[PDB]
Amino acid sequence: FXXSXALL
Amino acid sequence: FXXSXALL
Amino acid sequence: FXXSXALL
Amino acid sequence: FXXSXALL
Amino acid sequence: FXXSXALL
Amino acid sequence: FXXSXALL
Amino acid sequence: FXXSXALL
Amino acid sequence: FXXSXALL
Amino acid sequence: FXXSXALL
Amino acid sequence: FXXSXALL
Amino acid sequence: FXXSXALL
Amino acid sequence: FXXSXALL
Amino acid sequence: FXXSXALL
Amino acid sequence: FXXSXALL
Amino acid sequence: FXXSXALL
Amino acid sequence: FXXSXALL
């Protein structure tokens, strides 16, 4: 969950 | 991030 | 981690 | 938010 | 040390 | 039951 | 077992 | 490998 | 701790 | 991982 | 945590 | 809380 | 010696 | 007390 | 290891 | 736990 941390 | 969902 | 809270 | 990432 | 356990 | 003890 | 109290 | 993390 | 063996 | 340093 | 079930 | 894990 | 007994 | 013997 | 804690 | 150290 989260992806990269750029969007989320 | 998040754990499995079981707590968060 | 998480962003600021403004979205998440 | 999150701590270090070691627990969450 | 170690991180979440995901990578290590 | 419980897991590692690290977070729980 | 028990943790911070925030959840348990 | 490692165990619980409690002591190690 | 350990992972796949490829690196560790 | 790592502990007190007394052993690891 | 849990044990045999006899008590918990 | 819990002790060693032996009894609980 | 021993701590609480939770780890040793 | 002692753990398994593997550390102590 | 230890027995009761009386002798050891 | 351990006794005093005089034996163990």
CB-count burial class (<10 Å; 0-12, 13-18, 19+) for N6: exposed
What CA–CA distance (Å, rounded) separates P1 from N4? 17
Q: Which residues of chain L have a CB within 8 Å of the CB of M6?
A: 2-4
**Closest by Cα among F6, E1, C2 to B2:** C2
- Please name the residues in contact with H3: beta carbons below 8 A apart, sequence gap of 6 or more: none
Report which residue type is found at H3. Answer: X
PDB experimental method: X-ray
Q: Which DSSP category does L4 fall into?
A: T
Q: Do chains G and F touch (3 or more CB pairs under 8 A)?
A: yes
Query: DSSP per residue over chain N, as a string?
Result: --TTSS--
Residues 6+ apart with CB under 8 A from A1: B1, B2, B5
d(CA H8, CA N4): 13
Distance separating the N- and C-terminal Cα atoms of chain N: 10
Taking an 8 Å cut-off on Cβ atoms, the answer to whether P5 and M1 are in contact is yes
* Residue A2 tokens, joined: 């989260």
Query: Hunting for tokens 């990578």 — which residue is that?
Result: E7
E5: nearest Cα among F4, I5, L8: F4
* CA separation for the pair J4, A7 (Å, rounded): 37
* Residue E5, C-beta contacts closer than 8 angstroms, at least 6 positions apart: I1
**For tokens 């351990």, what's the residue?**
P2
**Kind and range of the H or E run holding F5:** none
